[PDB]
Amino acid sequence: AESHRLYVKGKHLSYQRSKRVNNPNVSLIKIEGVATPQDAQFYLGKRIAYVYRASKEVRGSKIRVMWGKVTRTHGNSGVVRATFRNNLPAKTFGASVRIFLYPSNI
Amino acid sequence: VEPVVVIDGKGHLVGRLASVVAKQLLNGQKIVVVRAEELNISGEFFRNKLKYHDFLRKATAFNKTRGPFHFRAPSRIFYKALRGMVSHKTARGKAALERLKVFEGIPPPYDKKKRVVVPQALRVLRLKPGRKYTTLGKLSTSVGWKYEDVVAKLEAKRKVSSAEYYAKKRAFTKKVASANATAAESDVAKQLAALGY
Amino acid sequence: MKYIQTEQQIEVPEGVTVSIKSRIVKVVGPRGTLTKNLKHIDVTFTKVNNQLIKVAVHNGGRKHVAALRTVKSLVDNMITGVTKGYKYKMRYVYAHFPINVNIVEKDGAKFIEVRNFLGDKKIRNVPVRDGVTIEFSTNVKDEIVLSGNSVEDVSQNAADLQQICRVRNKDIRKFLDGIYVSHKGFITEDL
Amino acid sequence: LRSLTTVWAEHLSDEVKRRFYKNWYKSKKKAFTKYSAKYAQDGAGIERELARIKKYASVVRVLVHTQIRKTPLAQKKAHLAEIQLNGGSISEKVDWAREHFEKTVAVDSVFEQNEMIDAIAVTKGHGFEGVTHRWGTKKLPRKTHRGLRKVACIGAWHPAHVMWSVARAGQRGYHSRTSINHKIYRVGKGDDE
Amino acid sequence: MAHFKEYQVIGRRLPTESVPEPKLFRMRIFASNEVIAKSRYWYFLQKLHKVKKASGEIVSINQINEAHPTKVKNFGVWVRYDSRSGTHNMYKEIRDVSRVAAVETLYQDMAARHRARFRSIHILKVAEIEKTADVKRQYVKQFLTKDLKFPLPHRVQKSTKTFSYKRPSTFY
Amino acid sequence: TDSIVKASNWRLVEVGRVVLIKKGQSAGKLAAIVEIIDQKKVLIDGPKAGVPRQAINLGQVVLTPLTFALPRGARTATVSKKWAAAAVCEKWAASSWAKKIAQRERRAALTDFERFQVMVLRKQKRYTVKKALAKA
RNA sequence: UUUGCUCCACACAAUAUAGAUGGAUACGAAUAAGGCGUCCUUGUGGCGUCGCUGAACCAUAGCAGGCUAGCAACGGUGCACUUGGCGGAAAGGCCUUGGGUGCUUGCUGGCGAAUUGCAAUGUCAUUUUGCGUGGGGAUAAAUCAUUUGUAUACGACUUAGA
RNA sequence: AGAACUGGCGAUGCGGGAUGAACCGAACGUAGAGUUAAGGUGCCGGAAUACACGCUCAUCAGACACCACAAAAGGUGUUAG
RNA sequence: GGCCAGCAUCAGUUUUGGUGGCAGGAUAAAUCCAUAGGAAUGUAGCUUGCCUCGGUAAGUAUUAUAGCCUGUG
Ligand SMILES: [Mg+2]
Ligand SMILES: [Mg+2]
Ligand SMILES: [Mg+2]
Ligand SMILES: [Mg+2]
Ligand SMILES: [Mg+2]
Ligand SMILES: [Mg+2]
Ligand SMILES: [Mg+2]
Ligand SMILES: [Mg+2]
Ligand SMILES: [Mg+2]
Ligand SMILES: [Mg+2]
Ligand SMILES: [Mg+2]
Ligand SMILES: [Mg+2]
Ligand SMILES: [Mg+2]
Ligand SMILES: [Mg+2]
Ligand SMILES: [Mg+2]
Ligand SMILES: [Mg+2]
Ligand SMILES: [Mg+2]
Ligand SMILES: [Mg+2]
Ligand SMILES: [Mg+2]
Ligand SMILES: [Mg+2]
Ligand SMILES: [Mg+2]
Ligand SMILES: [Mg+2]
Ligand SMILES: [Mg+2]
Ligand SMILES: [Mg+2]
Ligand SMILES: [Mg+2]
Ligand SMILES: [Mg+2]
Ligand SMILES: [Mg+2]
Ligand SMILES: [Mg+2]
Ligand SMILES: [Mg+2]
Ligand SMILES: [Mg+2]
Ligand SMILES: [Mg+2]
Ligand SMILES: [Mg+2]
Ligand SMILES: [Mg+2]
C-alpha cells in the first residue's frame, strides 16, 4: 500500500566511548520505541543497514549500504550497541539506520 | 518520530527545556521552540535579574566588540542555555544547531502546526509549589529587549483567530460524534468493540 | 514538620455574598463590591453554608500555615469593607507654619495638594486613589478624612500623604511637623 | 520596524530621477517608466497598495525631494528622503500623501517663528588627523625625540593590547551629528524683497 | 549503613580451668548481615566487659523477625549520638510496621537532621509504645486522631516519553 | 445571590479507599487502605486480588474514586468480607478507567490477522458514517 | 563579444544530500484546578461526564500495487479548472462555490503474478547546475578614462559630462 | 629549612582527579571478546532527568579527598534535641 | 576452487532470559483457623441535652446491629 517498511527506524548516535576516547569499532544505536534493555533484547542479532547515496553508479546503482548486526544492549534506556562490516563513517552520528526483523525468532 | 517538533515554550524551565532540546538535535531531531517569552527560570525575578547583570559585566577589556555578546531577546537567552550544552565549535555541533529554530510568539507556519510540551521541564510539574520563579519575557525587557508589547499585541490577535478555529472544530466534532452513534449498536460496531475498538 | 491540616473560618453576614473561582475572590455587599486575587498562595476554600466558608491548608509547613491566617483576614477585611467600610482620620500638625490642604484636579484627577509645609514654597501633591473619597472634616481643626471600601487603598492613600510630609535636615524629634493618621475605624456608626 | 510597500507618484521630476543614476548623460533614463504605467489601467494596482498601507502600517512616511535647481549649487542631482507624517490617523495620513503626489510643500507648513528645532547633518571633513587635534591631547614637551603631537603612553603593560579607549591618529570630521535646540529666528519667503 | 535485620547475638568469655561456664551475655543488634552484627556485638561488649573477641566466643547468632509485620505500631526510640562538638542523648518517636523498618528510617533521620553517620549512633532502646497518650512527639500524634483522612494535592504523573501532546493536569 | 465557593474535590487517603497498585509484583491489582502510617506510607490489603497485606508508599499506588466501609486496621479476612459485601470489583469494572485498561489489553493481544480484520471493519464503518455526517 | 535575458512547459545530461520511507494531527487559560456534553436565570450558574498519558487519533488490503466486470450508494478522495472570502509576525498559506475527470478495499466477480532461483536498500526521495527545443514576456546599466571639491595619504567620497 | 621509616616522582606511559611530575586506580609485546578499578551516569559526554527518607531558599545559596582557604561572635529564619 | 556472504549442526569463551527439584531458620515470622483475656482513636444498645420530625453532640456501655489488640494451641 502506502507503507512498505519491513524494518524498525533507528539512529546512529555515538561510537562506544570514554569521556575522552572513542572506539570506532562499536556503534551505538537508538531504536524507535525501545525504552529498556528488556525491550532491547528482542533485537539482539537483528541486522542493521545504513543506506546511503553516492554520485558514481557502481553495480548499476547510486545507492550503497553498510551492513551490520546488533550485538548487546547498552545502559538503561533501550539503547543498543552494534558492529558493522566496516565501522560507520561518523558524519552519520544522528543519521537514520534500519533494523530488520531477521534472523527471526517468532 | 515526526520530521519537525514544535515546542510551546510557555511554562517550561529554561535549562531543562535546553537540556532536552540539545539532545534531540544531537540525535538528529529538528526542533522549533515557540513563545520563548513565556519561558520560566526558577528563582524569583530579582535573582535572575542580578544574575543577568553579572553576565553583563563580562566583556573584552581592549575591545568590547570581541568580547562576550549579550543577547537580550528571550529566544536568544534561551539559545544561550542551549548552545552551552552542545559541542558547538565542532562541525557535528554546528550541524545539530541548524536543526534548531527559536521564536518569540508563534509566527507563521507554526501557528497552524501543532505544538507539544516536554513534561520533564514543565515548571508546573517540577517546581515545588510555593517556590518563586521568573518569566523570561519580563526578565528580558528589564535588560533591554524591545518587543514585549508588540509580541503581546500580535499574540492577542493570533489568539483571537485560533479560538475561532477551535470553536469551529469543536462544533464539527459534535456532529462527527453524533455520527458514531447511529453506527453504535450496529453489527460492524460491536464487532469492532470485540477487537478493542 | 508539616501539619496535615489547619483551617480557618470566615464568617459571612446577612448583607453579602462572596464567590471564589480558582482563587479569584469577589465579595459583594451594601457599600459596593470588592475582588482580590489569591492565586499566589495555595489554600483551599470551601462553602459550608451561606454564613460560613472554611479555608484550609493540607500538609503545610510553618510559612505556608502562617499564610493561612492572613488569607482569612484579607477576605474578612473585604467583607467588613463592604458592610461597614473604612474611615481613616488624620490631623495636620505644625509648630508655626499652618499646613494648608486642598483638593485639586488636573485632567479629571483629584489630588491632595499640600501647601506651606514648614514654610515650604514647594507644593505637594498626593493622588486621590480610586475607591477612596476625601473630606475635610467640619467642626474639627486641621483634620482630614479618607474613607472607602478598601482598607488597603484607604490606609495606603493615608500613608502616602503622611509620607509626603517627612521632614529633612532637621531633628525630627523637635520639628514634629506633618500630617499624621490619628484614628482608624469604620464608616457606619453605632458599630 | 519593517517597510512593506512603497507607492510612488506617476510623474517624477528629472531631479529625483537623476538621483537614481550614476551616469545620467549616458543612460536611457528608463527609471520608473514601467511603474508610471501602473496608473494607466484605471488605477487598480496603485490603489491596493495605498489600500494595504492603510490596512496595516503602524507608521507612515512620505518620500520627498529637494528642488535643487532652485539653488545656486552646481550639483544638479536632487536629494530624496523619508519624512514621518505625524498628523491624524493612519488612513488620514496616506490620503494626505496620495493627495500630495507631484504636489509641493513649504517650510511655513512645518516650522514657525521661535520654534526649537534640531539639525541632522554630516560634519565638515578634515582627513587624517594626528592625536593632538583629534582628541585634544597635550602637546608633549619640546625636548621629546620622535615627535611630540602624540600620546606618550598608549597603555599599561597589561592588558597587553592597545585598548579601544586610548586616543589615536585618524579620520577627523565627516561625521553624522544630531544637534538640538536651535531656535528659528526667521522663516523667510523667497518672493519677498 | 543498609537494610537492617535484627539479631540476637550471644557471647561469652572463653572457658578456663578455674572458670568453666562463663556468664553469657546477649544483645539485640540491628545490622544488615551477620558479619556486621557479630562485629557490633564485640564493639559494645568491649564498652561493658573485660573481653575482646580474641578471648571470647560468639555462642549464638539468630535473626529476630517482627512478631506482627502488618500491624502498624508507634515506636519510642532512644538514641545516643556524637555531634561535631559533643556527644548527646535523644528520644525520637517513629511510626512504622516493624522495629527493623523503624530503625532504617531513624538512621536516615539522624543523617538528614543531624548529619550523624552510622558510626556515630548508638541505639539505646527501641520499644513499642502500647497505649496512645504516652505517645509524646506531635509529628506522630497528628496521625492517630479519629477517622483521619487527607488528600494529596497537586498530583504529579511521571511521563514515559519526552513529548506530551496535552498539557498535564495535577488534579487527583 | 448565594455565595458559591468552587470546591476542589480530592480522593482521600483513608481507611476503605480502594487503590490501584502501579509498581511491583502486584501491579494493576486493586487493594484497600487499611490503616495509615504517615503522609507517605499506608497499610494496604487486597485479598480478592491476591495482593499481600503490606506497608506501601503512596507513591506506588494511585487512589481511585471508589471507597467502601472498613474499620481502621481490619485484618485480611475482615477485609475480604467487607470488600465482597460492597462489591467493589464490579464497581471498578463498571468504570471508564478499568474499561480503558481492559481495552488496550485487548488491543495488545490482537493477532496480525485480527488487526487486518479491524482495518477492514473500520473501512466499513467509515463508509456509513461519512455518509451520515453529510446528509444533515 | 557572433542570438543574449526572463517566467511557464519536457527532454537529455551532470552535481549533490548532517540523512523522506503512512500523517509536524493548530484554542486559550488554570494546575489548592480543568476538558467535554447538556440545561438555563448567560453566571465566579445548575446538572452530567472524562482523566490515572499519544498504548491515541487518522490513515492502512490490490504488479511499489497490474488488466478487467457488476451492484449498493450520492458518500469519500486525487487532479486540473472555476465562484466568493480570509490571512502581513516571516502573510506566500487557509477556507468556500460550481461543473469536469480519475480512483474507491462499501459489497460481489473474471484474468495476471513463478526463473529475482533460500537474504543481499535491491534502487520508487529532493539539491543545485549545464546544453539544446518552443509557448508567453522584457529590451539596462555599472565600471575605467575625463571632471567637481561639500571629499581625499592611496583606494574611497561627492559632482559634472550625447 | 632540616632528620626518621615506608611508599613514590626523577627513569613511566595508561584510566580517574577539567587542567597539573609526585594524589586515587592501575604499571605497558601486537590484537579479539568479556568483566572491572578509581571515578562517573540532566546536557556538553559513554552511563537511571532511577528509586527512597529527610534537610536547605541565600537582593553576592550550594555543589565531593589531596585542592586551590575563612574565624571569633551573632540571628524571634527553619529543623530536630 | 579465488572473493564475500546466509543458514544448519558443533567446539572455546562469554552475556541475557524462562522453567524443575531440593536444604536451612522460631523446622522462617505473618495471614487463616481455634481459644482464653483485654482495651479504645468505643461498634450496637441506653441515658440525658440542644435540635426542620432524626440527626448531631457527652455520657454510659466491652461484641451486641463493626471491629481491633495480647497470649496459648
Ligand atoms: Mg538627620
Ligand atoms: Mg542641622
Ligand atoms: Mg507587496
Ligand atoms: Mg595639523
Ligand atoms: Mg584642548
Ligand atoms: Mg575644538
Ligand atoms: Mg598627550
Ligand atoms: Mg633628545
Ligand atoms: Mg518482635
Ligand atoms: Mg551534508
Ligand atoms: Mg466539571
Ligand atoms: Mg461548555
Ligand atoms: Mg457550570
Ligand atoms: Mg487524540
Ligand atoms: Mg489500486
Ligand atoms: Mg520561518
Ligand atoms: Mg477484485
Ligand atoms: Mg529559450
Ligand atoms: Mg604513596
Ligand atoms: Mg636527572
Ligand atoms: Mg608512573
Ligand atoms: Mg586523562
Ligand atoms: Mg579539581
Ligand atoms: Mg560544554
Ligand atoms: Mg548519555
Ligand atoms: Mg534503572
Ligand atoms: Mg576532608
Ligand atoms: Mg538555628
Ligand atoms: Mg567472506
Ligand atoms: Mg556454544
Ligand atoms: Mg528455583
Ligand atoms: Mg465499621
Ligand atoms: Mg487472635
Instruction: Let me know if residue E166 belongs to a domain.
Output: no
Residues E128, E82: one domain? yes
Instruction: Let me know if residue E38 belongs to a domain.
Output: yes
In angstroms, rounded to a whole number, what is the distance separating the alpha carbons of residues D15 and D19? 7
Instruction: Let me know if residue E58 belongs to a domain.
Output: yes
Residues E85, E35: one domain? no
Please check whether residue E139 touches C, CB under 8 A. Answer: yes
- Residue pair A52/A68 in contact (Cβ under 8 Å)? The answer is no
Beta-carbon contacts of residue D43 (< 8 Å; ≥ 6 apart): none
Confirm whether any atom of chain H, the nucleic acid strand, is less than 7 Å from CB of B11.
Answer: no
Confirm whether any atom of chain G, the nucleic acid strand, is less than 7 Å from CB of E162.
Answer: no
Q: Residues F63, F68, F70, F76: is their CA dihedral positive or negative?
A: negative
- What is the Cβ-side half-sphere exposure of residue F115, based on CA atoms within 13 angstroms? 6
Residue of C59, C51, C46, C62 whose CA lies nearest to C8: C46
Please check whether residue D185 touches B, CB under 8 A. Answer: no
Question: How many angstroms separate the Cα of C98 from the Cα of each of C120, C163, F13?
Answer: 11, 18, 69
Q: Residues F22, F27, F31, F35: is their CA dihedral positive or negative?
A: negative
In angstroms, rounded to a whole number, what is the distance separating the alpha carbons of residues F90 and F93? 5
Cell numbers that stand for D161 in this block: 593590547
Residue of C95, C101, C92, C96 whose CA lies nearest to C128: C101
User: What is the pairing mode between strands B4-8 and B30-34?
Assistant: parallel
Chain G: positions less than 7 Å from a protein CB are: 14-22, 24-34, 36-38, 44-46, 49-57, 59-62, 64-65, 73-76, 87-94, 105-107, 120-125, 138-143, 148, 150-153, 158-162
Helix D90-99 to helix D44-55 angle (10° resolution) is: 150
Contact yes or no for D161 and B62 at CB 8 A? yes
Q: If you ran DSSP here, which 8-state letter would residue A100 be given?
A: -
- Residue pair C48/C54 in contact (Cβ under 8 Å)? The answer is yes
CATH number, domain C86-191, options 3.90.930.12, 3.30.160.150, 3.40.50.2300, 3.20.20.105: 3.90.930.12
The yes or no reply on domain C1-85 and CATH 1.10.3470.10 is: no
Instruction: Let me know if residue E31 belongs to a domain.
Output: yes
CA angle B35, B37, B40 (to 5 degrees): 105
Q: Which neighbouring-strand residues pair with B6? A: B32
In angstroms, rounded to a whole number, what is the distance separating the alpha carbons of residues C147 and C187? 7
Question: How many angstroms separate the Cα of B95 from the Cα of each of B25, B26, B88, F30?
Answer: 9, 8, 9, 50
In 10 A of CB E60, how many CB atoms? Answer: 11
Residues E140, E78: one domain? yes
Question: How is chain D split among helix, strand and coil, in percent rounded to 5?
Answer: 20, 20, 60
Q: Residues E7, E13, E14, E18: is their CA dihedral positive or negative?
A: negative
CA angle E140, E145, E150 (to 5 degrees): 85
Instruction: Let me know if residue E168 belongs to a domain.
Output: no
Instruction: Let me know if residue E11 belongs to a domain.
Output: yes
In angstroms, rounded to a whole number, what is the distance separating the alpha carbons of residues F43 and F48? 16
C98: preceding bond cis by omega (within 30 degrees): no
Beta-carbon contacts of residue C90 (< 8 Å; ≥ 6 apart): C143, C144, C145, C146, C158, C161, C162, C179, C180, C181, C182
**Measured CA E160 to C1' H37 distance, in angstroms:** 34
* Nearest nucleotide by C1' position to the C35 CA atom: G44
| Cα C28 to averaged position of ligand 24 atoms, centre (Å) | 58
Q: What's the domain count of chain E?
A: 2
Q: What is the 3-state secondary structure (H, E, C) of chain E?
A: CCCCEEEEEEEEECCCCCCCCCCCEEEEEEECCHHHHHHHHHHHHCCCCCCCHHHEEEEEEEECCCCCCCCCEEEEEEEEEECCCCEEEEEEEEEECCHHHHHHHHHHHHHHHHCCCHHHEEEEEEEECCCCCCCCCHHHHHHHCCCCCEECCCCCCCCCCCCECCCCCCCC
Question: How many angstroms separate the Cα of D84 from the Cα of each of D63, D88, D108, D112, D178?
Answer: 9, 12, 17, 18, 17
In angstroms, rounded to a whole number, what is the distance separating the alpha carbons of residues B20 and F1? 51
CATH number for E47: 3.10.20.10
- What is the Cβ-side half-sphere exposure of residue F82, based on CA atoms within 13 angstroms? 23
Residue of B nearest to F113 (CA): B195
The SS3 assignment for F111 reads coil
User: What is the pairing mode between strands B30-34 and B100-102?
Assistant: parallel
Cell numbers that stand for B65 in this block: 566588540
* Nearest nucleotide by C1' position to the E6 CA atom: I29
Instruction: Let me know if residue E171 belongs to a domain.
Output: no
Burial E99-122 (b: 16+ CB within 10 A, else e): bbbbbbbbbeebeeebebeeebbe
In angstroms, what is the C-alpha Rg of chain B?
A: 22
In angstroms, rounded to a whole number, what is the distance separating the alpha carbons of residues B33 and B107? 11
Instruction: Let me know if residue E153 belongs to a domain.
Output: no
Q: Residue B107 CA to chain centroid, in angstroms?
A: 12
What resolution, expressed in A, was reported for this entry?
A: 2.9
Residue of D90, D3, D9, D4 whose CA lies nearest to D43: D9
Contact yes or no for E150 and C1 at CB 8 A? no
Q: What is the 3-state secondary structure (H, E, C) of B28-87?
A: CCEEEEECHHHCEEECCHHHHHHHHHHHHHCCCCCCCCCCCCCCCCHHHHHHHHHHCCCC
Residue of B109, E151, B26 whose CA lies nearest to F17: E151
Residue of A74, A82, A83 whose CA lies nearest to A37: A74
Question: How many angstroms separate the Cα of C115 from the Cα of each of B16, C17, C118, C120?
Answer: 58, 44, 9, 7
- What is the Cβ-side half-sphere exposure of residue C190, based on CA atoms within 13 angstroms? 0
Question: How many angstroms separate the Cα of F96 from the Cα of each of C76, F86, F99?
Answer: 43, 19, 5
In angstroms, rounded to a whole number, what is the distance separating the alpha carbons of residues C11 and C89? 27
In which domain, by residue range, is E78 found?
70-146
- Residue pair A70/A26 in contact (Cβ under 8 Å)? The answer is no
Residues E90, E132: one domain? yes
Q: Which neighbouring-strand residues pair with E150? A: F13
Which residues in chain C are classed under CATH 3.90.930.12? 1-85, 86-191
In angstroms, rounded to a whole number, what is the distance separating the alpha carbons of residues E128 and E101? 13
